[PDB]
């Protein structure tokens, strides 16, 4: 699933 | 104008096969905020494709909810372009959103697939954002 890059 | 509620912009990454650090596109203003495409290799292996919002600002009071279509353009046939959709509340602690594994690296760099040409890959973002909070009071 989508999320932040870090 | 920069107050537009939506927009489509692109960023072509050069020497793609040699990408080793994350790259950022110039800003595209929507709801008067700077939005940028972020690309990075993840685990050769996969392509990291993220959408970033107002990252430079030192403000910690802003927030903007937006939906968007992240797409890797297929130059040979746009129906073969691959895209994923996102919906996210951007703010200082979560200023970007996307997929660390958006596409297999081997697929995007496959010269026979149509996504890469002269080691260049074009990324596109269609973002629809609501009015921001904590910015223009």
Give the CATH number, domain containing residue B10: 2.60.210.10
**B102 burial level (CB within 10 Å; 0-12, 13-18, 19+):** buried
CB contacts of A3 in chain B (<8 Å) are: 97-100
For residue B22, give both structure tokens: 């994350």
Dihedral sign from CA coordinates of B125, B127, B59, B93: negative
Domain count, chain B: 1
3-class DSSP state of B38:
strand
C-alpha B25: how far from its chain's center? 8
Q: How many CB pairs under 8 A join A and B?
A: 23
Query: How close does chain A come to B69, measured CA to CA in Å?
Result: 12
Domain range spanning residue B126? 1-137
Q: In sequence order, what DSSP letters do the residues of B47-59 get, joined into one string?
A: EEEEEEES-S---
From the CA of A2, how many Å to the nearest CA of chain B? 5
Do the Cβ atoms of B11 and B22 come closer than 8 Å? no
| CB neighbourhood size of B64 (10 A) | 23
Best residue in B100, B103, B125 to probe A by mutation, most A CBs within 10 Å? B100
Method for this entry: X-ray
């Amino acid at each position: 699933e989508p999320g932040g890059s870090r | 104008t920069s107050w537009r509620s939506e927009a489509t912009f692109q960023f072509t990454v050069e020497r793609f096969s040699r990408l080793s650090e994350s790259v950022l596109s110039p800003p595209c203003f929507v709801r008067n905020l700077p939005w940028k495409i972020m690309v990075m290799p993840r685990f050769q292996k996969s392509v990291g494709f993220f959408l970033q919002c107002n990252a430079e600002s030192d403000s910690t009071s802003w927030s903007c909810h937006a939906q968007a279509v992240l797409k890797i353009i297929n130059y040979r046939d746009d129906e073969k372009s691959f895209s994923r959709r996102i919906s996210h509340l951007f703010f200082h602690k979560e200023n970007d959103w996307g997929f660390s594994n958006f596409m297999a690296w081997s697929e995007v760099t496959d010269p026979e697939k149509g996504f890469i040409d002269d080691d260049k890959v074009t990324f596109e973002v269609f973002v629809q954002a609501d009015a921001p909070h904590g910015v223009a009071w």
